[PDB]
Amino acid sequence: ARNIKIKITEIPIPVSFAAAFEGERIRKNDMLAEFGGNKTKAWELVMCADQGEVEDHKIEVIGPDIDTIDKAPGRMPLGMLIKVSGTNMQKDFEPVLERRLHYFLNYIEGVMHVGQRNLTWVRIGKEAFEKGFRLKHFGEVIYAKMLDEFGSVVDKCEVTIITDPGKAEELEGKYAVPRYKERDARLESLVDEKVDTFYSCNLCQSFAPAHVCIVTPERLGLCGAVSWLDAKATLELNPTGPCQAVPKEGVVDENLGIWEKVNETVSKISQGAVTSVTLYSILQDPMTSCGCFECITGIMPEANGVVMVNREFGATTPLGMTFGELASMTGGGVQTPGFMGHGRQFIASKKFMKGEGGLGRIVWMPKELKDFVAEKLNKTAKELYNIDNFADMICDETIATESEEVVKFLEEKGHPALKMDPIM
Amino acid sequence: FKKPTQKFSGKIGEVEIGTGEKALKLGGESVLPFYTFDGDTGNTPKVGMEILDVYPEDWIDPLKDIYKDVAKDPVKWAQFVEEKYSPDFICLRLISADPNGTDAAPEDCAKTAKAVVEAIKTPLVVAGTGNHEKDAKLFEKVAQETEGHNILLMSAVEDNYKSVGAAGVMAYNDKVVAESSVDINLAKQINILMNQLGIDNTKFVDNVGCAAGGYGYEYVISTLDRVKLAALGQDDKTLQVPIISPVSFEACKVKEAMDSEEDSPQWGSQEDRTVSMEVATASGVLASGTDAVILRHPKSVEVIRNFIKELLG
Amino acid sequence: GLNIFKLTPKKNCKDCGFPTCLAFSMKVAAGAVEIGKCPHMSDEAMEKLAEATAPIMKTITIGKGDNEYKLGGETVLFRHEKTFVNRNRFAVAFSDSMDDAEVDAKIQHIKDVDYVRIGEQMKTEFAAIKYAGNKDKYLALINKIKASGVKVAYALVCEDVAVMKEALPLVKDENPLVYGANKDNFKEMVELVKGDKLALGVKADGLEALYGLVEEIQKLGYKNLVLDPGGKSIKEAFENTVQIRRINIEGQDRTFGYPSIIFLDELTKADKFMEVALSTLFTLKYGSLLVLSDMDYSRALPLYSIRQNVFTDPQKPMTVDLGIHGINNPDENSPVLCTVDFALTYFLVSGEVERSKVPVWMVIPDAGGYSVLTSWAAGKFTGAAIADEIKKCGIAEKTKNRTLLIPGKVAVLKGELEELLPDWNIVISSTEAMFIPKLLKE
Numbered sequence A: 001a002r003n004i005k006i007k008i009t010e011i012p013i014p015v016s017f018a019a020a021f022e023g024e025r026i027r028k029n030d031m032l033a034e035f036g037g038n039k040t041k042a043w044e045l046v047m048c049a050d051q052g053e054v055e056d057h058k059i060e061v062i063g064p065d066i067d068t069i070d071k072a073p074g075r076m077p078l079g080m081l082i083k084v085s086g087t088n089m090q091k092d093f094e095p096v097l098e099r100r101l102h103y104f105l106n107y108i109e110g111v112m113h114v115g116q117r118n119l120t121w122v123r124i125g126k127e128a129f130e131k132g133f134r135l136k137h138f139g140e141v142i143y144a145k146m147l148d149e150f151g152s153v154v155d156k157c158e159v160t161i162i163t164d165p166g167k168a169e170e171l172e173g174k175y176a177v178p179r180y181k182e183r184d185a186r187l188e189s190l191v192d193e194k195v196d197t198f199y200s201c202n203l204c205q206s207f208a209p210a211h212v213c214i215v216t217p218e219r220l221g222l223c224g225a226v227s228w229l230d231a232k233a234t235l236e237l238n239p240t241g242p243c244q245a246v247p248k249e250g251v252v253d254e255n256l257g258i259w260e261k262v263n264e265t266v267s268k269i270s271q272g273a274v275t276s277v278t279l280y281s282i283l284q285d286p287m288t289s290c291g292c293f294e295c296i297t298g299i300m301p302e303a304n305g306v307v308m309v310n311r312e313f314g315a316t317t318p319l320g321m322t323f324g325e326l327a328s329m330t331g332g333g334v335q336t337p338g339f340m341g342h343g344r345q346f347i348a349s350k351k352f353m354k355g356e357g358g359l360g361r362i363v364w365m366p367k368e369l370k371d372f373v374a375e376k377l378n379k380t381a382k383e384l385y386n387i388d389n390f391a392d393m394i395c396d397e398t399i400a401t402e403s404e405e406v407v408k409f410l411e412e413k414g415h416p417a418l419k420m421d422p423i424m
Numbered sequence B: 001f002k003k004p005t006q007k008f009s010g011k012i013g014e015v016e017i018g019t020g021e022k023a024l025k026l027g028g029e030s031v032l033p034f035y036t037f038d039g040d041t042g043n044t045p046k047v048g049m050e051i052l053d054v055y056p057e058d059w060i061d062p063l064k065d066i067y068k069d070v071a072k073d074p075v076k077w078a079q080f081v082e083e084k085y086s087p088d089f090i091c092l093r094l095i096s097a098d099p100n101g102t103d104a105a106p107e108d109c110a111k112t113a114k115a116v117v118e119a120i121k122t123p124l125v126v127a128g129t130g131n132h133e134k135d136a137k138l139f140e141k142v143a144q145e146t147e148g149h150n151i152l153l154m155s156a157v158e159d160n161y162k163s164v165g166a167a168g169v170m171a172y173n174d175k176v177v178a179e180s181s182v183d184i185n186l187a188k189q190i191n192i193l194m195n196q197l198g199i200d201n202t203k204f205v206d207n208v209g210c211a212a213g214g215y216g217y218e219y220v221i222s223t224l225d226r227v228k229l230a231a232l233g234q235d236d237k238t239l240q241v242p243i244i245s246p247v248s249f250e251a252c253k254v255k256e257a258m259d260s261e262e263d264s265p266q267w268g269s270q271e272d273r274t275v276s277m278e279v280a281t282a283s284g285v286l287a288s289g290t291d292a293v294i295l296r297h298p299k300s301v302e303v304i305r306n307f308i309k310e311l312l313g
Numbered sequence C: 001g002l003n004i005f006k007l008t009p010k011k012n013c014k015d016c017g018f019p020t021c022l023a024f025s026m027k028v029a030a031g032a033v034e035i036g037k038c039p040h041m042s043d044e045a046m047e048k049l050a051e052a053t054a055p056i057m058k059t060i061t062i063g064k065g066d067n068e069y070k071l072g073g074e075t076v077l078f079r080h081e082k083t084f085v086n087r088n089r090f091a092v093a094f095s096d097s098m099d100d101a102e103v104d105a106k107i108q109h110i111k112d113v114d115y116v117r118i119g120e121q122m123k124t125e126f127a128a129i130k131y132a133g134n135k136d137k138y139l140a141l142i143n144k145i146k147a148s149g150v151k152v153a154y155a156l157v158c159e160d161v162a163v164m165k166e167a168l169p170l171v172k173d174e175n176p177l178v179y180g181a182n183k184d185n186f187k188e189m190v191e192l193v194k195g196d197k198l199a200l201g202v203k204a205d206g207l208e209a210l211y212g213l214v215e216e217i218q219k220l221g222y223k224n225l226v227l228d229p230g231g232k233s234i235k236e237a238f239e240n241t242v243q244i245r246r247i248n249i250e251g252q253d254r255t256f257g258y259p260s261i262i263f264l265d266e267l268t269k270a271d272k273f274m275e276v277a278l279s280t281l282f283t284l285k286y287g288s289l290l291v292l293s294d295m296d297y298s299r300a301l302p303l304y305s306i307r308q309n310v311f312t313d314p315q316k317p318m319t320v321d322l323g324i325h326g327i328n329n330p331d332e333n334s335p336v337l338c339t340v341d342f343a344l345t346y347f348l349v350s351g352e353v354e355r356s357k358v359p360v361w362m363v364i365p366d367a368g369g370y371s372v373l374t375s376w377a378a379g380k381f382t383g384a385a386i387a388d389e390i391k392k393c394g395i396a397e398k399t400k401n402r403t404l405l406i407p408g409k410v411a412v413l414k415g416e417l418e419e420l421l422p423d424w425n426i427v428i429s430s431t432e433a434m435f436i437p438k439l440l441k442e
């Protein structure tokens, strides 16, 4: 009634718990129980349920306990179902809670957890079991520190550890598998038009003071480690942190991505260094770049398109400049028209240079980079109605490296970028 | 030509440390430091001297020779510094409280601080240890013992800002230093947390980090430049707070200032290098936007005070 | 960048030495190659390009090959906005009205103070020779310093055209600095330096007089100048130094786009601890050539260390040397520590172990000049890199203590390190900098 929360200082487990213990190695002959892998089925899930279904601090072990396997090191099914309820807990925060569960289990001595969803497997060492380690302690570690780290979104946490083969398969099909569907569909089907607030990150201003990253569902961070959902949860967990809400109010230009509020909130975060910005263009007031970007796209005027190059690529681009040479001017939080540093996932987005013609402006990519995004790039270009194999039209390092050679290759290929209106 | 007309919409707030006629004011400037030609430089930057609650064992021999018969007793040490060098403020670093060394209970250290604050007229700045956990308990007892003198509690990081700020500004009506790690965003974050807790800009000063010349110094210079430009140029209300940077803490521990002639014969005198190290470090941070510095060697104070006086008058 | 590409003929003929016109387009905007390399430019665009791309502040080269120092070229007022390009230089003042013993002490000090810090040669760069009234001893003073063997540049400070006419040929071939142009001798001073393209120092009373005087020299056609702020007090000298730079940069005025020479020996009136303070101030406040009264390790150690930090490009993280860095009496048995040569983590860690209480030799594997987490993300600070670094530096021989300490935030490598280094005992810390001494106690 008074919204009073009492904190628990000590994790009630006999085995020592510390961040230092992760990354250890259990001897191949000193394992006790190996749950999961290709050996048996193991899975994990964090649920956002109503307060009725979640009872605070309930740890349930369904099936044989660790004390039952007295024989040689063997395998048992493992099911870790975590139910979480809170006043402001939503389904978008479930992946954040589940990601941290990997490090929660690794912090325990003799317990190492690697994997996500149904691809997980946890091995228990002899050292923990002889010290009274049980499957009930697994739920004590999660519950004690789920309330600790997520103390502003998690009111009650209920953990069930399932190790019965019959129940482990059954609960996966009604809770785990259906909820993985929602995660994939939410990430794939979310576009900029549907959302109403963008997010701004400024964690790279330690070396690029003028740099502000605007994160949208179709345009994640330059480093590639921050997305719209991640920034949404960062703002909730850390209201005064690097990620802050950016209202999408006031639309100067829909095609170029100009918004009245975005320009207002960019000049504030960058301390007035950058005042006008666009989200879907690289020529008119482009976004700034810090230096964490793995791929940088540069304009190639003679080909009526743009060239791309990844960080690992150590050769010379058709632009005449390598990645290091291009990174010396694109980075640093300066607005350089015609050049943009971005992530590896933004390549196959429908907002990749929407205001500059679209995705078809790509004319040259590294061979290793082209293969990675070939499946996604071809699908996105299919919406442009051209033949599906768009990557086949894109030139690579193997075919040519000089500007006059690649232009000839584009002439014969019927590349769409040539026929489009002049980019510059 | 055209005289540069640089107009800043911001203005740094004023924080008063101490009580009586010796109380000092920090901040108030609406222009860059020492830019008397641009506008109003609010309050002249202050220079403070550092003392210890224990005998200085690691200080250089020339410093030990100055504080011969007064270093043993902090009360005698504080009165000796005040009457001989007349610093703007005296910094009392509670070395005996750190867990890494001669760890002592917070009650013992607060008793030492109580005697010092009641034996001097100059404002006192009580510097804590490096440990975040101990500083929360240390400052709770220190601020209770030294009540009614408006001391400055130093090194209140994001970890213990709730404990230090509550036991500091709000409870016993003191001042608190909000310390960040050489970042404008981290400095901006800690200030927001203090404001949300109920402490406005007039009750706490900022510490954006400090370093010795040649040891990560440009990082401190960039941070000082950025916070000053944001506070004034961008009228950022969450950065319009005065800045104090302890120079003697970092500048006097380096190899170039502690090595004696026996260790490095070519480097020359030891006292000259110690003074020259603090003067160079303090002058550079003063030009970047620091409103108060802490110095150890008495000769450094005289040079910096002359340095401040020459540029402003 | 793309602004001048419109004016470029777009032929990709590689005549400028760069592969594509775009490659030539972006670099000249930075200012490295400049505009001359392209001969195929149309004169209609060449005239407009020459003025738009012209830097707001000229770069002045003084001295010969080894003593080659560039002054000026700044584009920003603060280093965080963009890198400071050219570092300021320090000079030792020499006057012909000085005793032979005094001059010998100055020469030895210039030669004595010479060391390398993080790969940069820290030494006095210039030797300002001043004319005090006796011409006969002035030429002797110049010749003595040449015969001394001090590897310094020359800056003759002489307002007398007659004396300068005889003093210049002695060190004319050294590309010296000819200082002394004032209101009533500039016409005869420009013609003296126009032939050999030597930097000319401009002197006047106040900014208005200085601004007008620079225009007269520029109207003659000579623009290789080293302006002198000038002032009767430290307060006025500081104002003039700042105003010259702000007028040039903020006001986009190219009349004041020249480096500043500041005589700190006269303002401080030969005060060592004041010289160091003012040298730091003008290192951070647009002083391009600072003239001191004497040089010694008391001045050199802070001033040269600070200058190294200020004039490092913020975009390129500053880096520390590689190899083993033994702290406080390296010996035959002690634990070892790992870092990522970010030069901030090193200083933050070394700034915690500087107590020397527990001797430890910090091995620094090449992590790419990045921080701990980004190096591991990049794959530079990995188990193989840490393991093979032990092979490279041979730390097994130096210390017989298998206790190996690694950065705390590096977590998964602890098991991986143990595999590649079985005999070595790995200790994994916390990522806070406060836990450095706890495990150092062992």
Ligand code: B12
Binding pocket: A203, A204, A206, A207, A223, A224, A225, A226, A290, A291, A292, A293, A294, A311, C317, C337, C338, C339, C342, C344, C345, C348, C349, C369, C370, C371, C372, C373, C374, C376, C377, C378, C405, C406, C407, C408, C409, C429, C430, C431, C432, C433, C434, C435, C436, C437, C439
């Ligand atoms: C600056 C930065 C960059 C810059 C670095 C420039 C520079 N100045 O060095 C650049 C642009 C290179 C960069 C790049 C990338 N970055 Co980056 N980077 C950072 C950033 C902003 C700060 C790093 C830093 O200085 N941290 C602070 C320093 C002081 O900490 P530290 O070095 O760990 O040292 C401390 C401890 O280790 C400890 N310690 C050290 N030694 C010892 C010893 C003992 C005994 C003890 C007790 C303690 C101790 O004390 C030290 C001081 O407190 C972080 C943000 C963050 N949240 O950390 C992101 C961050 C680390 N970057 C990240 C990533 C992912 C990348 C990229 C891999 C992205 C990509 N391209 O895919 C790229 C890689 C580039 C490449 N070449 O491959 C992620 C890391 C994610 C992960 N799981 O790996 C972060 C968190 C950003 C994010 N998106 O969240 N980055």
Ligand code: SF4
Binding pocket: A201, A202, A203, A204, A205, A212, A213, A221, A222, A223, A224, A225, A226, A242, A290, A292
């Ligand atoms: S690149 Fe990533 S870490 Fe850097 S500011 Fe943008 S979102 Fe933050």
Ligand code: SF4
Binding pocket: C008, C009, C010, C011, C012, C013, C014, C015, C016, C017, C018, C019, C020, C021, C022, C024, C037, C038, C039, C040, C041
């Ligand atoms: S010389 Fe001129 S036309 Fe030829 S490549 Fe260079 S910039 Fe292009």
Ligand code: NI
Binding pocket: A204, A222, A223, A290, A291, A292, A293
């Ligand atoms: Ni970034």
Ligand code: NI
Binding pocket: A204, A222, A223, A289, A290, A291, A292, A293
């Ligand atoms: Ni970046």
